[PDB]
Design a protein around this nucleic acid. Structure first.
Lengths: 136, 50, 116, 75, 177
RNA sequence: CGCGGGGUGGAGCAGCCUGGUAGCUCGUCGGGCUCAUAACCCGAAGGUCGUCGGUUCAAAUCCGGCCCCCGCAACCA
RNA sequence: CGCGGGGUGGAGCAGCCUGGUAGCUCGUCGGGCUCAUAACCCGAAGGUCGUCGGUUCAAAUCCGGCCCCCGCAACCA
RNA sequence: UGCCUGGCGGCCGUAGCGCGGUGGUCCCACCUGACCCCAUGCCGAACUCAGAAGUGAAACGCCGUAGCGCCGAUGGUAGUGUGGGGUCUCCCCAUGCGAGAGUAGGGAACUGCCAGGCAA
RNA sequence: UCCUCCUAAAGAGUAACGGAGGAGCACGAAGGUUGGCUAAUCCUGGUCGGACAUCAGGAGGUUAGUGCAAUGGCAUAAGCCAGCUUGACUGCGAGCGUGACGGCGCGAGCAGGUGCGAAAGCAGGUCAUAGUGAUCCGGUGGUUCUGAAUGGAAGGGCCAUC
RNA sequence: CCGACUUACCAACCCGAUGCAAACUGCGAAUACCGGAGAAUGUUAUCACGGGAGACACACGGCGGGUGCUAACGUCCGUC
RNA sequence: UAGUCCGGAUUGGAGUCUGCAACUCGACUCCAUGAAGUCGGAAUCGCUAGUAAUCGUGGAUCAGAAUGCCACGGUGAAUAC
């Protein structure tokens, strides 16, 4: 499970998720699962999509994950009134914006990656695509 | 607390005194400083008091 | 570096002097020479300059750069200053220790008539 | 475990450049020394820069360390 | 002081051709020697450092500089600003006299002496050695001392490389092993 | 803050009284003694008498300043 | 999400309040006593004082983050 | 007037580092010694005085080099005041303002006053 | 109750049983001034000495330090050391900042007199921002200010102060 | 003893490449706020003093946020 | 009157003899080094006579190889109410 070990603070603000993403081009690999839908992926959602994508090619190739959560999310327990404090940290998410390459891949054919990234995509709440590392 | 207050009285016969603090549990010696006095209108020595 | 250290020693005084905006007389001591020039209140140009680099005073001394020689220019810098009219100035230790030549230089100036 | 805070000290620049202030008028109430004293301005005890003599406020950046300075043109 | 003139002419003319000095001012010269002794265990007995001071006060011809603790180390139990020893950066006429009184009558005096190391260098040209016996000196009669206390001696010269520093010390006939 | 009265070997207390006397009980070590721990007997070490100064032939004791402690009634900023 | 107290030789307990030094019971190891075991006797070993950091001349001791343990609390409709 | 240097500045990374070369008639630093003024919580290293055989390594100035630091458009993009619309947990249209980053490129300064050396 | 940061939307201000931590002091010097100095952490050699005692050299650069929590700030150093001293002084205070007000904060300059420095100048606490409670009542020293017929006294006033 | 050899692994410090930040900043708007000058417009709309008040439970919509579940005709502030 | 000329283990080096052979594993000579141990807790052993205590000598075993065993003689007590 992805999680930043001993960060600066425990609980943190919600904050709005606006604008477009910064990580656009496929940097390391030759393929990529660029996102279109604006939302946030939890660590559980990423790991589920990670295993489903690793298993697609079974073992080969290299799989990068350029997205790390680092934004803890709180939640109030069952049967508790409002106020009285800030809930405990349950899951860590990462604010994803349009044009963000979540995962990359290299070492597989363009045919297999079109299959691998299609499977994991149905494990994510956001709407994705499939791009290629262009000429510069 | 640790620092109690004392009274730095003048040397001359005038009853003018300055108050301050002192750490009795660190310095058992006395305080002899020079300050201005509004009665003698000069500078004299100052003896301690409580 | 020996040079730079002497410079930051003079900064304390030089900053205060331009805040006062006083006519200051800088002193640049040298193993073999002495420098002294009266600087204007704008801290940009000088008004009266005198040193042993001027041969007119150099040949009148035994060695260029010792107590009596530095005192000679002290008498000289105060002479030309009063001719220009400047009487009240402020000393600029300039990173040197006020002990030897720089001292006798100022003692000569205060004895020559430089009001400071 | 939280809830504690303090009284706002009302810091910041009081008079901006251009205003003809009078002597004694506080110009900048700061903590560190973001702004420094130039001409006709003295650094206070709390580093509170004030006007020593009348004139208009002027902000300028002198020094090789590029620090903010406030002087006063006697106008 | 007698090897000072020996240096000024004999040693100078010798090295000017090895490293081909185009100018006479390119010759390396000894600058400072250190008489340091950090006994360390002075945290238990205060008079230890004074005797450690007196021993260094006897071998040298001037008072030393009692060094204090730079920080607070709990591993050796020493706090901020605590006496650890004393040093002497002798740089003058006695430093040449000190050099004579060491490499001629003190070096061959070490119990189980076999030679010096030609590897103890920093890389800039500074040689450093460490002796265990304090009896190798002329002033100690062994009747006044009561310790087997040793110290560290380091000579810093104005060279550029350690191979040049070894060359400078080679001119002063050092029995390297 | 005010008043009273103490600080004594490793512990407490007597001794402070009217100024020339530092001991008793337990403990430690060794020996004697019993089968053994103990009980018992003898010998020895263990105390700037909280501290400084003053008066005095002599002070831990008398007195003043100081530190700490205990007890006491009181507390209408 | 809470309050007070505690964590110390193999099993555990004092000492903390008023910091320079670690004591006790059973137990362990070895010897002795007995024909043998137990008990008893004698000597010795045996405690990073829960952990980390800091302050203080000295930290089991004083403070706090964290970890573990216990009792009480989930009450009126 | 130019080549030089030292001193006091203005503007202060286009101004500063790395590397190589170069300078000593003057200037500058190193350098000789230290009974005396002074100095090391030791020590003439630093500080100071009395002088200066010699040197230009170190140091400092200058020059080339741009391998770095730095500076930096135009255009586009993000953002956004105001007035409207929508698939109104976010965006679009009209209009005014308009980065950062990056690119082409620039870039190892400029200069005011005084006082000496030196060629005239 | 007070202090620091964010929330706070680029002046000030701004709430919540919103998120993070501190204070109820300390020092006769850790204050003032004069003069000088400026690291931390690493690489290398070396008696005890080993990850961490000391010294010397280089790299590096303020990540150090700043009596304490955090932020802003500082080499002109406010960081460190030493000599000499007490300005941690008395009477004021133009003109501003900040508060409903009480109140709090800054303050050039003035007169008396003082310390340091050759002098220019600097000092009415400490790099700054918390370290603290109003009034009434009572206690202490001083000042003929008054003192219920007069001269005193008591008791009040006023100053300092608990 | 000195102490050499090695690893189905993890990883600091640097170089290149890529993201995150309310409690990060070698950068940095639009607006907002302060001061000065000028034009037009507004029954002086501004400021000071005095008499009389009320009020000190706010709601929703837009934009900017904390909180909640970027739930609530939810709740707490800024601003219109 | 000190761990000292007490004490003698340990260990380095050089040699002797035996016996095919001295490394595991011999006794001894020479020089040097030179520790523990300052009469020993609980507890416990032998002895009344020329014994104890103390000193030295010899033999068996055996190529060589004991502080052991057996044997010998010298010096020679105290106490038993």
């Amino acid at each position: 499970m992805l999680q930043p070990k001993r960060t600066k603070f425990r609980k943190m603000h919600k904050g709005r998720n606006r604008g477009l993403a910064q990580g656009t081009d496929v940097s390391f690999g030759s393929f990529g699962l660029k996102a279109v839908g604006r939302g946030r992926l939890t660590a559980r959602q990423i790991e589920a999509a990670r295993r489903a994508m690793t298993r697609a090619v079974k073992r080969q190739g290299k799989i990068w994950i350029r997205v790390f959560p680092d934004k803890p999310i709180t939640e109030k327990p069952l049967a508790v009134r409002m106020g009285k404090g800030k809930g405990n940290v349950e899951y860590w998410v990462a604010l994803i914006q349009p044009g963000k390459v979540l995962y990359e891949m290299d070492g597989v054919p363009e045919e297999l990656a079109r299959e691998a990234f299609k499977l994991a995509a149905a494990k994510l709440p956001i709407k994705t695509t499939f791009v290629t590392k262009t000429v510069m | 607390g640790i620092r109690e207050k004392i009274k730095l009285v003048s040397s001359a016969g005038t009853g003018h005194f300055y108050t301050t603090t002192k750490n009795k549990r660190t310095k058992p010696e006395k305080l002899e400083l020079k300050k201005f006095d509004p009665v003698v209108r000069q500078h004299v020595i100052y003896k301690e008091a409580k | 570096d020996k040079k730079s250290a002497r410079i930051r020693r003079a900064t304390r005084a030089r900053r205060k002097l331009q805040e006062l905006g006083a006519t200051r007389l800088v002193v640049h001591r040298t193993p073999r020479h002495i420098y002294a020039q009266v600087i204007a209140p704008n801290g940009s140009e000088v008004l009266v300059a005198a040193s042993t680099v001027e041969k007119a005073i150099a040949e009148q001394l035994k060695y260029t750069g010792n107590k009596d020689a530095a005192a000679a220019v002290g008498k000289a810098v105060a002479e030309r200053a009063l001719e220009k009219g400047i009487k009240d100035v402020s000393f600029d230790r300039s990173g040197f220790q006020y002990h030897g030549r720089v001292q006798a230089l100022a003692d000569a100036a205060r004895e020559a008539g430089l009001q400071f | 475990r939280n809830g504690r805070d303090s009284e706002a000290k009302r810091l910041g620049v009081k008079r901006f450049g251009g205003e003809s202030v009078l002597a004694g008028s506080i110009i900048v109430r700061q903590r560190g020394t973001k702004f420094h004293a130039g001409a006709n301005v003295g650094c206070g005890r709390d580093h509170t820069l004030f006007a020593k003599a009348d004139g208009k406020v002027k902000f300028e950046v002198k020094g090789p360390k590029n620090r903010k300075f406030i002087s006063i043109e006697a106008e | 002081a007698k090897l000072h003139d020996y240096y000024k002419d004999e040693v100078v003319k010798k090295l000017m051709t090895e490293f081909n000095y185009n100018s006479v001012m390119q010759v390396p010269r000894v600058e400072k020697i250190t008489l340091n002794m950090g006994v360390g265990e002075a945290i238990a007995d205060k008079k230890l450092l004074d005797n450690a001071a007196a021993d260094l006060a006897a071998i040298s011809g001037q008072k030393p500089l009692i060094t204090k603790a730079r920080k607070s180390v709990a591993g050796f139990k020493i706090r901020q600003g605590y006496p650890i020893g004393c040093k002497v950066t002798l740089r003058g006429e006695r430093m040449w006299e000190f050099f004579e009184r060491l490499i001629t009558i003190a070096v061959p005096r070490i119990r189980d002496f076999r030679g010096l190391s030609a590897k103890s260098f920093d890389g800039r040209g500074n040689y450093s050695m460490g002796v265990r016996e304090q009896i190798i000196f002329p002033e100690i009669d062994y009747d006044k001392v009561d310790r087997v206390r040793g110290l560290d001696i380091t000579i810093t010269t104005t060279a550029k490389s350690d191979e040049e520093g070894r060359a400078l010390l080679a001119a002063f006939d050092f029995p390297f092993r």
